[PDB]
Scaffold this active site. Structure first.
Site, PDB file in Angstrom:
ATOM      1  N   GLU A  52     -50.348 -12.122   5.854  1.00  0.00           N
ATOM      2  CA  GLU A  52     -50.057 -12.735   4.390  1.00  0.00           C
ATOM      3  C   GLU A  52     -51.504 -12.597   3.864  1.00  0.00           C
ATOM      4  O   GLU A  52     -52.193 -12.290   2.279  1.00  0.00           O
ATOM      5  CB  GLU A  52     -49.238 -13.741   3.855  1.00  0.00           C
ATOM      6  N   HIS A  67     -32.388  -4.030   3.827  1.00  0.00           N
ATOM      7  CA  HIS A  67     -33.220  -2.510   2.967  1.00  0.00           C
ATOM      8  C   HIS A  67     -31.974  -1.329   2.811  1.00  0.00           C
ATOM      9  O   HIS A  67     -32.658  -1.282   1.531  1.00  0.00           O
ATOM     10  CB  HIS A  67     -34.506  -2.177   3.783  1.00  0.00           C
TER      11      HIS A  67
END
Ligand SMILES: *[C@@H]1O[C@H](CO)[C@@H](O[C@@H]2O[C@H](CO)[C@@H](O[C@@H]3O[C@H](CO)[C@@H](O)[C@H](O)[C@@H]3O)[C@H](O)[C@H]2NC(C)=O)[C@H](O)[C@H]1NC(C)=O
Ligand SMILES: *[C@@H]1O[C@H](CO)[C@@H](O[C@@H]2O[C@H](CO)[C@@H](O[C@@H]3O[C@H](CO)[C@@H](O)[C@H](O)[C@@H]3O)[C@H](O)[C@H]2NC(C)=O)[C@H](O)[C@H]1NC(C)=O
Ligand SMILES: *[C@@H]1O[C@H](CO)[C@@H](O[C@@H]2O[C@H](CO)[C@@H](O[C@@H]3O[C@H](CO)[C@@H](O)[C@H](O)[C@@H]3O)[C@H](O)[C@H]2NC(C)=O)[C@H](O)[C@H]1NC(C)=O
Ligand SMILES: *[C@@H]1O[C@H](CO)[C@@H](O[C@@H]2O[C@H](CO)[C@@H](O)[C@H](O)[C@H]2NC(C)=O)[C@H](O)[C@H]1NC(C)=O
Ligand SMILES: *[C@@H]1O[C@H](CO)[C@@H](O[C@@H]2O[C@H](CO)[C@@H](O)[C@H](O)[C@H]2NC(C)=O)[C@H](O)[C@H]1NC(C)=O
Lengths: 193, 597
Positions: B357, B487
């Site tokens: 991240e 998704h």
């Protein structure tokens, strides 16, 4: 002995960049060593005289320009490096005899709700010659078609407003700028250190 | 008085107007995701509607500038992004109906519960209940129950919603001058205008298939090895020549085989590489963990994290009093505001993902001086690929030793090396057929090549052939197992993951060659390499200003994606598997089934 001469420097509020302010200073005792251990100046560099000889010098006329701009745009306040601020708002003469001063106001100019009190010009017909102002609300129209009435499709309102929040990055936090310029004349006034 | 000058002034106004509006929307959505209240969700939706309305006004305006008359490639790209009619080309009512069913699918997926028939008081949602079963359970019948309950409950609800989703999304894309919604998605990789670097939309299929062909043998051998090892775990349930039962793969769908490491470990005597116990036993500070990632990034020539990041980021679980969304996210709010939202625990998985991240944030920190519409990855795969190369370097035992969580002994038997590479493959290559097949099925569905009366038929036919996985129980067209993935039911494309896996090893090879690394590629730690740092920053700064092909060439020397980085990373495991499967079946029958008649 009549002028703290920094009623400009520290105060309640300043003016916008496109309507920057001028002030005459006279009959003063310029001591600037106490301002060397002041709040750290983001940038303090002189062009015509020496910072180690300031108070010894006894000049005649002095003027002060105060206004507020963003953080990345601050490095444009200099002769050359023409840009958004350096053309449409406030340009400096190529021959410059003076000093430039700036510091950072953490939460003075920034509030949690946001500050929308400082303006700046983005659209103008031509680059401003040194020490000029144009506060006109003339609807800019680069396309041939002159709307001239209101907001238009290819027309634009030339004045935009700063948004200053207390969580912004350093690149656009409220920077407070004061510029000192000593005009070169053969007539005396009362200033020295 | 030129069109180009008119377009430049229009783009200046848009950038300066949109920066602040995007910043207000980002601040509001952050306050929601970090502090779930009704006031915050209403403020987020207000700011988001304001932002969308401004964008649509600017779209109809930018549509008034004839693109064909533009000779400047950069301004043409920004104009194209704005001229995208998007959803607006739908009628109002049809668009409303599409948004309604989209939110409904998202809701039922994230809220669906299945209850145990033997004890109807025990009920689990997908996270964490059903996932805990699919990760740790060794019982075939319990896993089969979990697999079938999730699909036969929520997916049946999703089926009709998904049919309407498919037809409307294809219509929108068609109105936006595309063949179908998959072609719209394929437009992300399209390059049109730069001589010597263009790349068409059919070339993606060519490249994906040509490259999946080369990956095929490595996956086949891993499949054989895992199949034998699983036969030892579920005796009398698995044929030595058949596809893998879908419910024994480590999660609800088989997207990752990570939880099969305990059942497939080559050398049990060799210690598994886990540093969780070291972190707890060592003085830790959550600040410090994230600070250590920051120290890593500065060591290669990248800037520190901003004071705004350290003050505004949320680095710990706020507790029971303040409920937040704990999905690790890297927020690029704009106006130089960068944050990370993560409910960090002291675990090895969170260490690498923190690096991942923060790699996102460095990407986000980069290209900041670019105009607004260019503040984005080169294509949809670049950000995650960058995050993933960070985590590999951090996962290497050399880096783990140098940071001081590991013993100074550094024992590295050829068997400890094979253990690490095998665990990598369960994750990295296990996801590629899944990824390739999902997007292939979705693309074909959008093209109208799979009739309504054979959605599930072709899905499981394709399942068998490509991934080597077979369903444990039969499914008719009442079921809708494809819509059972996040998704798919939340309108996110999936091919980014295939593309990101190849990009990341290309980057890793390049930066390790830059760092003059000599040993096996998987032992490479790019730490303390300002040369590798500069080469990556040289790519990061472009954003979406240059074509992704040109940006990739700038760093790796190739205009297209390449498989040799992945294959060279896994070459030692490949030969070890080839030896280990000498007396094992290689291949798969497309005909074997667990069930009969
Ligand atoms: C504008 O800014 C501030 C007002 O907010 C003033 O700065 C500081 O004023 C204090 C007194 O209130 C100064 O303390 C003094 O220190 C000197 C030695 O340095 C000592 O001799 C005095 O007796 C007193 O204790 C402080 O130093 C001073 N800081 C600076 C900038 O020197 C400032 O005077 C204001 N001026 C104007 C023109 O608005
Ligand atoms: C397409 O249009 C963009 C404008 O948006 C062109 O980019 C710009 O390139 C010029 C020339 O290099 C830059 O001007 C320079 O600015 C620096 C600022 O320090 C100044 O010192 C120089 O004297 C010069 O004036 C301009 O800043 C830059 N603008 C942006 C937004 O990047 C671009 O070159 C055009 N495409 C082609 C192929 O020409
Ligand atoms: C992984 O490492 C091990 C050792 O750490 C490697 O093993 C060794 O393999 C050689 C053959 O390549 C063995 O040699 C032979 O010894 C037998 C008698 O035991 C003899 O009859 C043969 O003619 C040959 O000389 C050796 O004993 C063995 N050592 C150990 C400790 O197992 C192994 O090859 C490595 N694997 C890879 C892929 O590099
Ligand atoms: C979460 O949102 C609430 C408002 O919905 C924030 O409000 C707090 O309540 C009053 C509001 O004026 C403040 O004076 C309090 O100090 C806040 N309570 C706290 C900080 O415990 C609240 O601050 C938000 N929480 C976070 C973490 O942002
Ligand atoms: C890579 O960078 C790290 C930075 O942490 C280097 O670690 C330091 O190494 C020197 C020499 O051994 C020690 O004196 C310091 O105390 C270490 N600092 C730490 C552990 O925080 C490491 O040596 C570098 N590796 C190289 C240059 O090969």
């Amino acid at each position: 002995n009549l002028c703290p001469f920094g009623e400009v420097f520290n105060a309640t509020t300043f003016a916008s960049v496109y309507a920057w302010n001028r002030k005459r200073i006279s009959n003063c005792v310029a001591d600037y060593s106490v301002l060397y251990n002041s709040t750290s100046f983001s940038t303090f560099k002189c062009y015509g005289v020496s910072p180690t000889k300031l108070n010894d010098l006894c000049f005649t006329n002095v003027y002060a320009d105060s206004f507020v701009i963003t953080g990345d745009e601050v490095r444009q306040i200099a002769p050359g490096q023409t840009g958004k601020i350096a053309d449409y708002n406030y340009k400096l003469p190529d021959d410059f005899t003076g000093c430039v001063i700036a510091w950072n106001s953490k939460h003075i100019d920034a509030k949690e709700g946001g500050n929308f009190n400082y303006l700046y010009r983005l659209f103008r017909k031509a680059n401003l010659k040194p020490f000029e102002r144009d506060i006109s609300t003339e609807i800019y129209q680069a396309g041939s078609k002159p709307c001239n009435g209101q907001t238009g499709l290819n027309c634009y309102y030339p004045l935009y407003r700063y948004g200053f929040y207390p969580t912004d990055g350093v690149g656009h936090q409220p920077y407070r700028v004061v510029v000192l310029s000593f005009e070169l004349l053969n007539a005396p006034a009362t200033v020295c250190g | 008085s030129t069109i180009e000058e008119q377009a430049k002034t229009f783009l200046d106004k848009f950038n300066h107007e949109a920066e602040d509006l995007f910043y207000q929307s980002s601040l509001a959505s952050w306050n929601y995701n970090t502090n779930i209240t009704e006031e915050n969700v209403q403020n987020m939706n207000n700011a988001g509607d304001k932002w969308s309305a401004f964008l649509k006004e600017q779209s109809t305006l930018a549509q008034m500038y004839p693109l064909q008359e533009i000779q400047n490639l950069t301004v043409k790209l920004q104009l194209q992004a704005l001229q995208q009619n998007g959803s607006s080309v739908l009628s109002e009512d049809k668009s409303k109906r599409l948004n309604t069913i989209l939110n409904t699918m998202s809701t039922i997926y994230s809220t669906g519960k299945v209850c145990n028939p033997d004890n109807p008081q025990e009920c689990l949602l997908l996270e964490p209940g059903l996932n805990e079963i699919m990760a740790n359970s060794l019982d075939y019948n319990e896993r089969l129950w979990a697999w079938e309950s999730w699909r036969s409950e929520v997916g049946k609800q999703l089926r009709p919603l998904y049919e309407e989703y498919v037809v409307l999304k294809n219509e929108m894309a068609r109105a936006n001058h595309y063949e179908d919604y998959g072609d719209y998605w394929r437009g992300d990789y399209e390059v049109n205008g730069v001589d010597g670097y263009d790349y068409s939309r059919g070339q993606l299929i060519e490249d994906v298939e040509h490259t999946f062909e080369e990956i095929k043998p490595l996956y086949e051998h891993l499949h054989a090895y895992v199949r034998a090892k699983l036969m030892n775990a579920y005796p009398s349930y698995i044929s030595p020549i058949g596809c893998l039962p879908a419910h024994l793969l480590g999660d609800m769908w088989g997207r990752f085989w990570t939880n099969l490491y305990s059942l497939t470990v080559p050398f049990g005597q060799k210690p598994n590489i886990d540093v969780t116990d070291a972190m707890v036993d060592q003085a830790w500070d959550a600040q410090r963990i994230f600070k250590e990632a920051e120290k890593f990034f500065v060591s290669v020539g990248l800037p520190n994290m901003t004071q705004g990041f350290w003050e505004n980021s949320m680095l710990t679980d706020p507790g029971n009093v303040q409920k937040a969304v704990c999905h690790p996210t890297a927020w690029d709010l704009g106006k130089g505001d960068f944050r990370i939202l993560m409910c960090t625990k002291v675990t090895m998985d969170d260490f690498l993902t923190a690096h991942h991240e923060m790699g996102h944030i460095q990407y986000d920190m980069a290209y900041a001086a670019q105009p607004f519409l260019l503040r984005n990855g080169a294509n949809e795969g670049f950000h995650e690929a960058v995050g993933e190369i960070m985590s590999l370097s951090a996962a290497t035992p050399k880096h783990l030793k140098s940071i001081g969580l590991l013993s100074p002994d550094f024992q590295e038997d050829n068997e400890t090396e094979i253990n690490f590479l095998l665990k990598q493959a369960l994750t990295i290559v296990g996801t590629l057929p899944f990824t390739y097949m999902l997007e292939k099925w979705r693309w074909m569905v959008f093209k109208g090549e799979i009739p309504k009366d054979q959605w599930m038929k072709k899905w499981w036919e394709m399942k068998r052939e490509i991934v080597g996985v077979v369903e444990p129980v039969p499914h008719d067209e009442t079921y809708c197992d494809p819509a059972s993935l996040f998704h798919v039911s939340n309108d996110y494309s999936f091919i980014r993951y295939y593309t990101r896996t190849l990009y990341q090893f290309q980057f890793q090879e390049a930066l390790c060659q830059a760092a003059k690394h000599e040993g096996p590629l998987h032992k490479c730690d790019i730490s303390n390499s300002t040369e590798a740092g500069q080469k990556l920053f040289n790519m990061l700064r472009l954003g979406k200003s240059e074509p992704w092909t040109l940006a990739l060439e700038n760093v790796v020397g190739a205009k297209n994606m390449n498989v040799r980085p992945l294959l060279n990373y896994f070459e030692p495991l490949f030969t070890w598997l080839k030896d280990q499967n000498k007396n094992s079946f290689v291949g798969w029958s497309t005909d074997w089934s667990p069930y009969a008649d």
